[PDB]
Nucleic acid binder design. Structure first.
Ligand code: CL
Ligand code: CL
Length: 335
DNA sequence: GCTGAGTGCCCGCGTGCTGGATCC
DNA sequence: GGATCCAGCACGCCACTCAGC
């Protein structure tokens, strides 16, 4: 009956050693072999627009040249593209830091604003920094503001009653994330994409994202972009109806998902954040050094050792997700 | 659409314990 | 040794969604 619920519980209660992860698709070592199962659907290669993004535009936002990306889809899931980590070595750190220290501060609205004010809310980063100096990090203490951060809205905010977006309490969308999103969208064949509504989600090792569909009336020709940084996770992509058996796949640090049309209508969930392997506190793609020569225009710049130390201690047991949508038609504003 | 069961949307709240950590 | 603390859990409740009619 309720196949998605049962598999969601299965992968949630997965403790590496308890449950079998053999059916979870790893796009980093993609099969491409013709039907090497059921029940897993076939993985197909997705041709990219290699010439649509200049290597300099890709480097300014930390991405490899589009000629080097490998993208895949799944048979039966039109509109779903999975791009394993296309970032240049060391470039995920800048976007992680943007999520942790920059995008978390005002005017952006977070969960922390529900029962607090901009008092220490603006001092989230300084609080974590002070925690790291005092070595009070193993010491017993109340959870920091950074550790209590769960989500952040960017750009237009969604109305759960209207099922529509509006300009009420609009906060400006970050232009650098918009540029990165536009590069990814153009590379996937979506011309004229404008990042306008964003969600940042911060997950602990026991965090989950339940089964849900997106029901808002939007232009389904436009892509939705989903970036993941930090610890790996398992992602479940289901069907139009909640009781269809989903397909499981890994989300490694730097992986990007692009969803359009049909696949935007499907049930999906994130049942589990996997703990890091032994002796691999962080993914290899997060410790690599930045390229020596950076473009003078580059939006990715090396950050403080203090800032990255905060980021690394946080990401040791966390996953960060960025979700980006276009909600307004090309040209038209919000009247 | 209605209604009881099921989880906690970019939905949680308040309160009383408690037992491991902390302090000297 | 021993007094003290308090972060987090359990719990009951509210918020909101889902499923079966
Ligand atoms: Cl959507
Ligand atoms: Cl489609």
């Amino acid at each position: 009956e309720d196949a998605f619920r049962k598999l969601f519980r299965f992968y949630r209660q997965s403790r590496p050693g308890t449950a079998d992860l053999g059916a979870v698709i790893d796009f980093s070592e993609a099969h491409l072999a013709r039907s090497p199962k059921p029940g897993v659907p076939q993985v197909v290669r997705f041709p990219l627009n290699v010439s649509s993004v200049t290597e300099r535009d890709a480097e300014r936002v930390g991405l490899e040249p589009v000629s080097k990306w490998r993208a895949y889809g799944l048979e039966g899931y039109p509109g779903f593209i999975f791009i394993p980590n296309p970032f240049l070595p060391g470039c995920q750190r800048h976007w992680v830091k943007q999520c942790l220290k920059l995008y978390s501060q005002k005017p952006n609205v977070s969960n922390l604003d529900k029962h607090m004010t901009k008092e220490e809310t603006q001092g989230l980063w300084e609080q974590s920094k002070e925690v790291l100096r005092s070595k009070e990090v193993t010491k017993r203490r109340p959870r920091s503001l950074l550790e209590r951060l769960r989500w952040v809205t960017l750009g237009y905010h969604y109305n759960w009653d209207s099922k529509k977006y509006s300009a009420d309490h609009y906060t400006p969308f970050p232009s650098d994330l918009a540029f990165l999103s536009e590069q990814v969208a153009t590379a996937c064949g979506f011309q004229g994409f404008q990042a306008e509504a964003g969600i940042l989600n911060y997950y602990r090792l026991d965090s989950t994202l339940g089964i849900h569909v997106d029901r808002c009336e939007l232009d389904h020709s436009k892509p939705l972009l989903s970036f993941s940084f930090g610890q790996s996770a398992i992602f479940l992509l289901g069907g139009l109806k909640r009781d269809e058996a989903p397909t499981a796949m890994f989300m490694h640090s730097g992986d990007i998902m692009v969803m359009s049309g049909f696949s935007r209508l499907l049930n999906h969930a994130v049942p589990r954040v996997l703990p890091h392997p032994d002796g691999e506190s962080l993914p290899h793609s997060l410790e690599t050094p930045l390229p020596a020569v950076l473009p003078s225009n580059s939006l990715v710049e090396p950050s403080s050792v203090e800032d990255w130390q905060v980021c690394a201690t946080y990401l040791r047991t966390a996953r960060v997700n960025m979700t980006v949508r276009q909600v307004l038609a090309t040209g038209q504003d919000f009247p």
